[PDB]
Amino acid sequence: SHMLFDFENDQVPSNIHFLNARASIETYTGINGEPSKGLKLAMQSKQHSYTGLAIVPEQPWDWSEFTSASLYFDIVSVGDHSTQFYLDVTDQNGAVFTRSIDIPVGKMQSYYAKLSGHDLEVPDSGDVNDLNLASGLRSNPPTWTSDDRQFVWMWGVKNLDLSGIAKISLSVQSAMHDKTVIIDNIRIQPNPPQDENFLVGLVDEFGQNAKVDYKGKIHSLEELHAARDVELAELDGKPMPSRSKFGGWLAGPKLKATGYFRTEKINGKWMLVDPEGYPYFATGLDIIRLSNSSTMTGYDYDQATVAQRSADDVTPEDSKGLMAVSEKSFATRHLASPTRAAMFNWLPDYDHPLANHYNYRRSAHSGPLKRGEAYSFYSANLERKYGETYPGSYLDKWREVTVDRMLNWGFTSLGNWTDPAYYDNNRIPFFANGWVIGDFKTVSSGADFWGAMPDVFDPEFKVRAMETARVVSEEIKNSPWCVGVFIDNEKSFGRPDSDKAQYGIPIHTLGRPSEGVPTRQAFSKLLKAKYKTIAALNNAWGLKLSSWAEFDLGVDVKALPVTDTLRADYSMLLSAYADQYFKVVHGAVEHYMPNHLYLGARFPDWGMPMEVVKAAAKYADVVSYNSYKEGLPKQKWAFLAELDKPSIIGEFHIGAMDHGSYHPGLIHAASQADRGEMYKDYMQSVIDNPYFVGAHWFQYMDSPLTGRAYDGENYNVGFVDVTDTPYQEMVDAAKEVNAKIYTERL
Ligand SMILES: [Ca+2]
Fold first, then answer.
1. Is residue 146 annotated as involved in ligand binding?
2. Which residues are bridge partners to 603 per DSSP?
3. How far is 152 from 337, CA to CA, in rounded Å?
4. Contact in structure between 498 and 608 (CB atoms under 8 Å)
5. What is the rounded CA–CA span in Å between residue 110 and residue 561?
6. Binding residue per annotation — 353?
7. Number of independent structural domains in the chain
8. Residue ranges of E strands in 611-691
9. What is the residue range of 734's domain?
10. Which residue intervals define the domain Glycoside hydrolase family 42 N-terminal in the entry (predicted)?
11. Is 495 a known ligand-binding residue?
12. Which ranges of 431-517 does DSSP label H, i.e. alpha helix?
């Protein structure tokens, strides 16, 4: 309806710019079967971590008349690899949204990204940290039916200023291979009418996509018991050959045995060493528990019947056990979200054998509900599969089968957020964790994502860190099977988008008075020692403060341009903040678990300023990073060499959309088989990096189709689906990697 680029005049448009990519116009077979001229985009994404194109018109495009329309592209990958494109669309006010999808090799398809209308109209809950759509799904089922593919929602602004679209970017990021696509028919089409029922009847009685059939979908209890029987016949509890008791490499050489997991460089490559002295390399899955397997039903209970949290609890609500819902709570049950309730084709009555799989969450990070009833279809399917030989017996069977799977699949560990009931399994090592939470004073990065940042100079922060480590130690029982302890996860230490974002903690804290703010008192002390006189600081910051006492009221550095002196100061303050965080946490872990490795705080790509990484290097035995990319690119990881610290990937994943999910997750594959190929590529990258001692995949099970209760993530990121059935493509990929982790490294 509004053609932007059909490439038929045989010219590479001059308004299109190429980032580490070569462009040409070629003839290819289009979506309708007919040859057409398209833009061939050959990205040098093996060598370069950011590649692609950007369309940047002279003056921003005015598409304000398109009140319910989408941007369309015909795209296909050529060659050996699928391509995950990030589509970023920026308006004249600098507002941006990001969508992404996999582009398979094979037949060209049409892809669309909504600009306006439909599920963009009431876009979410409002909250800036709410990345979901209004439904409480990270991405929705499409709002109409067609052969076309909808770009998946990732993050950003749902309603751009259509009167000025300034830039359209398609990029390939942190790839392990050169990617090549053909793009054609960049256009705008008004949206079809919104299907009234697009959020209705999404889920069947097994928690599966009710509207779509796919390979492996369960259609009966018989089919489920059949899948169960086939798998159980193959699981015999036997570890891969040449594994030591603790999952290490029997062939050796054997190093000094200390009785606990430890680190050591073995001929130029960092390794773990198991309690008996065998070289070790950690592989396994995160979230080996049921806590995150429930989805909001849209019902609520009258609050007099809900137990409230204890202020001294060390476990945040998201990581609590599934809450046993009482008959009296359930009787008070009432509709709070019609939209949520209508998604479910079946939910059990109080008297049904599957009614124990209800959950209640008293808080949420984001989504349409702040609290509510939830249901775990996965847990219900465990009961369906394994039945009861005594009350709760399906949970014990799930734990036994889980360990048997891990051993068959060749994993050397259970990863982070393993339920403490596995801690005495004594057949496979595990990683422990705790969270430091409590009523201690806080600071802010100015863009805190999961939660506010702790004031690590408040004595109560240390009190709570000590209680946290105490509880973990009680769980661990000083077991040699515990590889190490993660504390906290993806803290907002400062984002890399800008220098002010990066130094958000110094900027925000400097803005506050010293009185009552321990971290501000610490920052004030450091700057007094640096500058001595307020006059030196005035000239460094270009200010005219009358005294240290005025300085200590709080200073709005946020409005000042970042200069050399301000940068040096923010760097110094960030370092001191991060040093104190890691000092206190390490001290607590060491106090209660003196034998065990402390594994850091799991840095994401949006939260690893170097000042904080160097702080972790000082105190953590092993520095942890979560890295959702296609692998570990040379340039992005070159800093590791100067630190010379053993490192671990706490999280990665790849998902697909061919098994009923509305959202593949953070990194996208073309199919379950392609998921398996991409897994192998990622792990090869880890195996090849001499600083890494392991990598854990997030997570064991798919997230619920309609979103995990905590924050609406609804991804295909499991080694098993909602019916507890393994993706065999992922099993095979894991076995291939796990059979060679040691021969490769050693
Ligand atoms: Ca064309």
1. no
2. 625
3. 24
4. no
5. 44
6. yes
7. 2
8. 623-626, 647-651
9. 200-745
10. 519-630
11. yes
12. 459-476, 499-502, 504-510
